[PDB]
Amino acid sequence: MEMEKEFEQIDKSGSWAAIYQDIRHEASDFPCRVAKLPKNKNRNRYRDVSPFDHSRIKLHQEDNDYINASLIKMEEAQRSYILTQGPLPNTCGHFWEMVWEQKSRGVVMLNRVMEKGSLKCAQYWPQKEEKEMIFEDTNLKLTLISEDIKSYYTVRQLELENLTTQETREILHFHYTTWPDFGVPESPASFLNFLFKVRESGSLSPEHGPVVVHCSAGIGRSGTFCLADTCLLLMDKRKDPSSVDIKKVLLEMRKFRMGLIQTADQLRFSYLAVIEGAKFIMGDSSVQDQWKELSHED
Template sequence: MTVSFRQILESLSSYETQQVLRKQFEAANHADGERMRHALEEGGTAQSDVGDSLRGSNYNLNRYTNVVPFNHNRVRLSGKADYINATHVTVSQTGGRYIATQGPLGHTRGDFWRMVWEQQAGAVVMLANPVEQLQSKCAEYWPTPVGEVLKLGDLSVSLGDERPLEGCLSVIARQLKIARGAEERAVMQLHYTEWPDHGVPQSPVPMIRIMQELERAGSFGTGPVVVHCSAGVGRTGSFIVLDAARRFFRQAADYDGDFVGDVFGSLRTQRTLMVQTFEQYLMCYQTVHYMLNSRE
């Protein structure tokens, strides 16, 4: 007999359920680690799943040497220099499309905005701060203060407005404009400032407010939502799981099986280390439980 997802959520507080979830996570983590280890050992050979990321100058475009995209679903920029550490991610249960990417380095800010432009993305979710625990986690890739313009190659980025999201001081909403020649496009950036690296948020409310804003704005544009933290895996993967769950359960009362586990398993086949720690994995279940039992 198939257990429903709501039944799993109702048993979350039990030691037995948490142990089952831990074993599931550890098994997926081991398989993912082995796949990436073999891929990195094969290096730039034709057999490597990640060879494009290690080839020539591409190696210096990665923030972390062990977090690189697979060849088959990496985002490809136009032109000869087509590499960026970013992955096309899809959620089959909802049809949702995302780009999971690392926080830009100082010398990849132009590539980041080229990607946003070429993929016609209208919304960027930022889940890291430029500096965390005295370490650089993400270059500041937008102009400050309001009214300033940042020139990056043939693109220019300007900041039109910056303020806390209504009712949520830990999320900064930035209204940006990206232009190439005479063509301009609006881009909304939602920056959650209080999610610790490798950790979990103290409250689910800021994440839910970000999801509500994405929905209210229609996610802007016609392209995927760009999501990044520092490496573009732990916090990024967790957010995608939660956004997918919110979208799915807006239309469905229940799910046969384990929704979080199924989406997590799919994400791990698309980009390494998505939902990086067991604490983040368990938080996904707890947050979905909260969403399903509260009035937004």
């Protein structure tokens, strides 16, 4: 059964919430004892979003190795991702330490620093070339080299320098800037064009460490990115769009980080993204359309 026919049935029955709640009941639960240590309270944005001990990323420092970040290892798809919360004002150094140590080439950001009048993450990268950031706690310097601001996303080139060695590396920052404040995008076209730009950059290739993906909590919008990417990889590897079950893939990813996909709307969106991405790859350009009637509803 094509995913598209499954989607039509779920939409007809209105059963997105039911299917989502079934995934939540079936999801793994593993300990997160390190995350819950008192000394780590100020390293977590939310008390109920924690990395599992088995898959947490460890910082390579002796002081405190903890960061709210998880390694998602998709063995059949042969890709890995690090899912993390948006950095806090006191964890921006830790975030770039992670990027350095894990050898990541790309960072993928799916939120705005400010949304609905609230701080969703710290301003952890420089906005101006001439005003570089120094993270004194982890001995890193970060400079903005260039940016390309497009309608639905921005791509930045950053230089990250290890001040202990003076080694430098180029990091690509892929920033999806147009996720709505409420709900999900009506069409996945722009999010798929984003995804494909990330892939085109080389950042997801096996010569690099895992891409770092975040939103505010690092489970909801972040989960949609990783889920859509891996489902598309599996469709290509099995040479059968129809053998991939997105609910099974999501449950597999939830072995590595709790909570991935946080609403029924996000689950529907991830399905739409994978369907429309597969259709685009197979020759359908119309799924990039977002033609709308003339309206002035605002």
